[PDB]
Design a protein around this nucleic acid. Structure first.
Ligand SMILES: [Mg+2]
Ligand SMILES: [Mg+2]
Ligand SMILES: [Mg+2]
Length: 628
RNA sequence: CUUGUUGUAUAUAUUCUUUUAUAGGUAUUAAACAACGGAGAUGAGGUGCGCGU
DNA sequence: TGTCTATTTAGGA
DNA sequence: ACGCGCACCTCATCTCCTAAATAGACA
């Protein structure tokens, strides 16, 4: 289907950040009006006004005065049962005839058709569509029993209606036939919807009225669609623009209709659309009408779209393999037994076991676990327990981590020497992934420390915390996000996350290409033990009630007793030898860090996007990914 | 225009950074592999801090 | 006026 | 754990990536 390619402009282009800011301001004004009138005006009033003030006989007014829409609320313009172009034209010409979004023109004098009607307004409408089309009135799924209340009958009714947009009586029958005509249908499941189809006929007025009342209910707490302040992107639809190859070059020139003249924007070339390739001809033959101007690191990029589908060359089925996700010793664990059958596979656990320096530090249990993994096809020896030794310098695994790192980097040097590029990049990315995750943890912890220090030195005082209007104004005037300190830390975090994402992509590509280049025709990615952080001191005092309680006899939940028996909390006593404050000892303050270190790699290494990367690699590869 | 973005060097120098220290910044040298459907919005989860239980 | 750019309208019955 | 705020991050879901005809601008 559709595809994208991004180009970088070469030289100085009139499209600056001010053009994009103007675009976004118009977007937000239009969205503000649309939000504030989602129910205050009906479609018939709009169509009647357009008929009166212009007197035109067009379908977008004949479709706004018919019996269906002449009195329904404006938000039905955004639903899938109303013609798209009629909704667009009716809404746009209403807004244009009344100057609702305040359009006073644009800086570059780009044609209003490409900037306003098929630009920011087009995005506003396409955005308000997804809000209302996914709009799931408050509802859940429950098993329908014979002795179930009227709500249970009605909830599963409307729940399936939303999932299938069925309105007429006949459409209910069609969904009943949807599964029955399919081989081996579930008899009980379809009857569950047949019963509600029967219920649909009894009191349809109550059903439709309640569904629309709920829809109106979920459209007054909606604050509208908002384009953020960090976007730096504008989209223009232009029917007639020209993209041309340069003369004696690899780049392109974009001829953009701009102030009634053709402005030429020079673009660099991509090795992605490169000279003499089929993708180049496809791009230059079938490119779409949407142009996206985006600024990234103070550089202007231009995104075009086109149609290109490659011809998948199949291969004979050989094997199917299961990939499992783990978090303890290695990320990727296979069900195969490593017999050196795989070509281009380096077994790093089996390599770490051939060094006396490493296994001499191992116990009998640890050595047994490592030998278990060495016989298994595994990838990415991310060892979370040893990795924390780089942060905690007093960890009992501090020397194991050093030997692991030294041996892994020695293997990296050896692979670089022997010109084994694929395995070399794999090992480099593994090492860099470990280092970069330690860096990300350090940066995130510094972010937390800096936020805490800023919000304690700021000293918020709230007269009433029940609602925003009663709290301190500096909560919103001067956040920590707007402090210079945060932007530096957030930029560093973004850079580290970028490196982490790249290294994980490299490892995933390595795994996929080993299994592809060995005959495996499916890699069935077989589809989370959060360590618990010690309860905080404020939780220890104001929540677990360890304040003014006797130190000798502590009335608390047994988990707190076990934590106190460990040297985690140091308690500060008073004249009565009872607790008035507490702190973290070294042991507890580092237990908290260990728990955070283990939990953050769950949410930072994108382990719920691994399947996505394998799918994308299967979009152009000899292997397929079967979800388990 | 040996041309876009991102990853991959435990490279040379540094009176740089503990807010990326087995890594980065500032300047160089050195590449060859690889991935590349984006933009926008909404919703749901999780998380940190602060103020109250 | 001729040519090139911008604006309009698109239905379901 | 709960509430109110301020943020941050990862996921899921959806829309949209047209085209002919007419009107207008200006030499
Ligand atoms: Mg980087
Ligand atoms: Mg590169
Ligand atoms: Mg150095």
């Amino acid at each position: 289907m559709k595809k994208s390619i991004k180009f970088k402009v070469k030289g100085n282009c009139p499209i600056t950040k001010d053009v994009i800011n103007e675009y976004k301001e118009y977007y937000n004004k239009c969205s503000d009006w649309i939000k504030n009138n989602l129910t205050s005006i009906t479609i018939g009033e709009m169509a009647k006004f357009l008929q009166e003030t212009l007197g035109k006989d067009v379908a977008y007014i004949s479709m706004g005065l018919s019996d269906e829409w002449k009195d329904k609320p404006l938000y039905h313009l955004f639903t899938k049962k109303y013609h798209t172009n009629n909704a667009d034209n009716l809404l746009y010409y209403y807004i244009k005839e009344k100057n609702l979004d305040g359009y006073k023109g644009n800086t570059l004098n780009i044609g209003n058709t490409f900037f306003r009607q098929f630009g920011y307004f087009k995005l506003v409408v396409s955005n308000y569509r997804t809000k209302i089309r996914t709009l799931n009135c408050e509802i859940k799924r429950k098993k329908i029993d014979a002795d179930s209340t009227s709500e249970d009958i009605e909830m599963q009714t409307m729940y399936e209606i939303i999932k299938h947009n069925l309105n007429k009586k006949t459409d209910w029958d069609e969904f009943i036939s949807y599964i029955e005509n399919v081989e081996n249908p579930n008899i009980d499941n379809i009857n569950r919807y047949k019963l509600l189809r029967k219920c649909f006929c009894e009191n349809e007025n109550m059903i439709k009225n309640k569904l629309e009342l709920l829809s109106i209910e979920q459209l007054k707490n909606f604050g509208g669609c908002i384009m953020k302040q960090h976007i730096n992107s504008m989209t223009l639809i232009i029917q007639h623009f020209k993209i041309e190859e340069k003369e004696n070059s690899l780049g392109f020139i974009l001829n953009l209709p701009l102030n009634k003249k053709q402005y030429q924007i020079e673009l660099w070339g991509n090795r992605q659309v490169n000279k003499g390739t089929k993708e180049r001809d496809a791009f230059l033959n079938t490119y779409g009408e949407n142009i996206v101007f985006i600024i990234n690191n103070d550089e202007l990029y231009v995104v075009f779209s086109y149609e290109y589908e490659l011809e998948k060359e199949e291969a004979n089925f050989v094997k199917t393999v299961g990939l499992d996700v783990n978090f303890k010793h290695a990320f990727f664990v296979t069900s195969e037994k490593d017999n050196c059958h795989l070509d281009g596979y380096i077994n790093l656990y089996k390599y770490l076991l051939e060094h006396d320096e490493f296994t001499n530090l191992l116990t009998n249990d640890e050595k047994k676990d490592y030998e278990e993994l060495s016989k298994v096809v595994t990838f990415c020896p991310f060892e979370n327990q040893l990795l924390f030794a780089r942060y905690n310098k007093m960890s009992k695994f501090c020397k194991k981590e050093q030997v692991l790192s030294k041996l892994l980097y020695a293997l990296q040097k050896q692979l670089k020497d022997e010109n084994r590029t694929k395995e070399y990049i794999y090992v480099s990315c593994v090492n860099k992934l470990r280092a970069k995750y330690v860096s990300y943890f350090i940066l995130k912890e510094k972010y937390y420390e800096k936020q805490k220090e800023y919000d304690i030195e700021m000293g918020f005082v709230d007269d009433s915390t029940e609602s925003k209007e009663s709290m301190d104004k500096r909560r919103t005037e001067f956040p920590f996000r707007n402090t210079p300190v945060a932007n530096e830390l957030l930029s560093k975090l973004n850079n580290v996350q970028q490196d982490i994402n790249g290294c994980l992509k490299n490892i995933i590509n390595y795994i996929y290409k080993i299994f592809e280049q060995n005959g495996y025709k499916i890699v069935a990615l077989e589809n989370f033990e959060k360590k618990q952080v010690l309860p905080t001191i404020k939780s220890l005092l104001k929540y677990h009630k360890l304040e003014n309680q006797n130190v000798n006899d502590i009335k608390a939940s047994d988990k707190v007793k076990e934590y106190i028996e460990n040297g985690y909390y140091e308690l500060i006593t008073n004249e009565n030898n009872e607790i008035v404050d507490a702190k973290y000892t070294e042991k507890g303050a580092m237990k908290v860090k260990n728990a955070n270190f283990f939990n953050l790699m769950m949410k930072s290494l994108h382990f719920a996007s691994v399947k996505d990367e394998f799918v994308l690699l299967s979009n152009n590869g000899k292997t397929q990914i079967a979800l388990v």
